[PDB]
Amino acid sequence: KILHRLLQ
Amino acid sequence: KILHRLLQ
Amino acid sequence: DMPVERILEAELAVEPNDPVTNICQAADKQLFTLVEWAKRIPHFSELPLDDQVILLRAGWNELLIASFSHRSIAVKDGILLATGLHVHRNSAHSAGVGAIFDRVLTELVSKMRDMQMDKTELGCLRAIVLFNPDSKGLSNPAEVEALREKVYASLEAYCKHKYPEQPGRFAKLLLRLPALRSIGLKCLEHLFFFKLIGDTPIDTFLMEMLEA
Amino acid sequence: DMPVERILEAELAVEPNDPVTNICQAADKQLFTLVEWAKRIPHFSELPLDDQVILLRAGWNELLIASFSHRSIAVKDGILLATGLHVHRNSAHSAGVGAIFDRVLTELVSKMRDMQMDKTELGCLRAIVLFNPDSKGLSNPAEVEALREKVYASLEAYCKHKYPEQPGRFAKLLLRLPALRSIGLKCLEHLFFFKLIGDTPIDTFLMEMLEA
Numbered sequence: 078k079i080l081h082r083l084l085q
Numbered sequence: 086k087i088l089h090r091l092l093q
Numbered sequence: 094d095m096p097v098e099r100i101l102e103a104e105l106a107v108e109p110n111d112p113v114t115n116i117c118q119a120a121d122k123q124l125f126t127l128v129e130w131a132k133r134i135p136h137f138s139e140l141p142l143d144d145q146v147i148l149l150r151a152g153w154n155e156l157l158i159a160s161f162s163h164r165s166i167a168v169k170d171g172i173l174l175a176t177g178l179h180v181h182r183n184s185a186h187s188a189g190v191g192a193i194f195d196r197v198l199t200e201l202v203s204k205m206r207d208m209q210m211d212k213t214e215l216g217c218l219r220a221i222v223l224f225n226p227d228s229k230g231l232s233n234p235a236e237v238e239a240l241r242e243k244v245y246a247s248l249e250a251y252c253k254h255k256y257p258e259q260p261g262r263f264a265k266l267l268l269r270l271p272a273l274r275s276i277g278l279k280c281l282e283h284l285f286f287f288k289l290i291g292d293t294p295i296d297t298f299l300m301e302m303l304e305a
Numbered sequence: 306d307m308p309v310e311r312i313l314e315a316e317l318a319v320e321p322n323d324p325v326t327n328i329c330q331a332a333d334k335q336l337f338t339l340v341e342w343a344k345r346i347p348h349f350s351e352l353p354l355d356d357q358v359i360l361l362r363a364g365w366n367e368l369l370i371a372s373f374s375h376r377s378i379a380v381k382d383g384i385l386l387a388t389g390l391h392v393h394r395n396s397a398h399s400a401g402v403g404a405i406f407d408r409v410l411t412e413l414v415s416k417m418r419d420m421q422m423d424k425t426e427l428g429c430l431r432a433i434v435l436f437n438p439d440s441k442g443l444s445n446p447a448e449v450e451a452l453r454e455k456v457y458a459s460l461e462a463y464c465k466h467k468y469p470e471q472p473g474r475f476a477k478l479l480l481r482l483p484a485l486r487s488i489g490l491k492c493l494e495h496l497f498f499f500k501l502i503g504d505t506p507i508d509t510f511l512m513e514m515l516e517a
């Protein structure tokens with residue numbers, strides 16, 4: 078999840 | 086050992 | 094197009110106790126910087142968000158190992174972690190990771206120092222590792238493969254122009270990836286040894302990479 | 306000098322039930338042929354006998370994997386072992402090695418078939434793997450490194466002359482080595498799984514490679 082939010 | 090003898 | 098100038102800017106834009114705990118802290122700390130580095134790589138953000146996750150989850154380990162190895166070109170027989178801690182042959186040996194430590198030095202750090210691998214060549218290699226067409230689940234591996242080919246296409250031209258008298262330098266750079274592959278696999282094992290035993294705290298970001 | 310003509314002759318000179326048992330039988334059978342192939346590689350026999358042992362004990366696994374992968378370019382979604390047995394996705398899956406089987410196909414066999422890797426390019430890659438300067442214990446790794454550089458120096462010239470319109474073909478070939486490195490490590494694990502459990506007979510030559 079955190080990886081998804083950091084890329085956005 | 087067998088590797089040594091095969092190379093010779 | 095894959096300009097080496099921006100790949101270098103990506104490298105330039107993301108630069109700055111118990112050895113085991115420091116290792117885990119450093120890996121978690123640099124996972125955040127890795128995302129900012131990837132964003133700055135040309136065409137990476139254009140890919141589908143799901144493929145970006147696959148590429149980062151698939152190459153984050155090798156990407157970080159390549160970073161601290163080149164960062165450790167200046168340290169004398171040691172490794173410089175992102176937390177500022179210098180891990181030498183004694184601390185690593187007493188930490189139970191002496192074998193893999195020697196591999197990092199003899200196969201990566203020392204090899205990087207001998208050939209004077211610059212940060213442009215480092216970025217291109219990390220960009221090549223990032224654009225891994227072998228990553229499972231990629232919606233379009235061909236596009237990732239096309240970006241990889243563009244990367245080492247710009248790297249070879251850079252090597253031929255920057256080091257015209259080292260015709261084999263381009264091949265020498267790519268031939269460090271096999272070592273990075275095996276070294277990364279071994280380092281990942283120790284990370285599970287660290288996490289599994291619970292002996293070492295594992296932070297959120299690193300924890301997320303170590304899980305499904 | 307490292308003439309590609311003889312490396313091809315080395316490849317040409319060494320060509321010809323339960324899946325698990327066949328795998329072990331094939332690996333042992335091709336270990337003998339591997340020695341005859343190495344002898345025919347230019348300058349290999351000139352090296353000290355102890356370094357030859359180190360290079361063969363260090364690369365025999367990847368060397369054999371590269372052999373049966375290219376040998377399996379003709380098999381439809383399967384692998385052709387040296388014993389003549391064709392292991393497909395079903396037999397491999399029912400044998401407990403379905404995951405690594407898919408990797409061999411998607412990362413090696415299929416990649417070899419798509420680019421039409423010829424036997425000269427195969428030999429050069431196997432010669433590069435043979436001349437591994439990262440092997441531990443080599444009395445003179447620089448000499449091994451020099452032979453490796455001579456190998457991919459002849460390969461690049463061969464690719465530029467044989468495939469002038471594929472400028473990135475040379476880099477594409479070398480970039481299959483990282484996969485071969487990780488795939489070999491996983492295959493080696495299964496070999497220990499096979500040997501350790503005693504469920505599968507392990508012959509002398511293969512047994513010697515699996516030991517100290």
Ligand SMILES: Cc1c(-c2ccccc2)cccc1-c1cc(/C=C/C(=O)O)ccc1O
Binds near residue numbers: 195
């Ligand atoms: C480098 C390392 C070791 C290690 C440290 C000393 C000697 C031998 C191995 C162990 C586990 C993880 C790691 C590891 C650290 C990092 C952190 C790098 C940084 O500080 O930027 C990233 C990926 C890793 O697999």
Ligand SMILES: Cc1c(-c2ccccc2)cccc1-c1cc(/C=C/C(=O)O)ccc1O
Binds near residue numbers: 328370
């Ligand atoms: C190829 C393989 C597997 C395997 C087979 C099917 C699907 C997935 C993995 C397993 C263990 C060893 C091996 C293995 C075989 C060979 C034999 C090759 C040949 O027949 O020439 C050499 C090295 C190896 O690691």
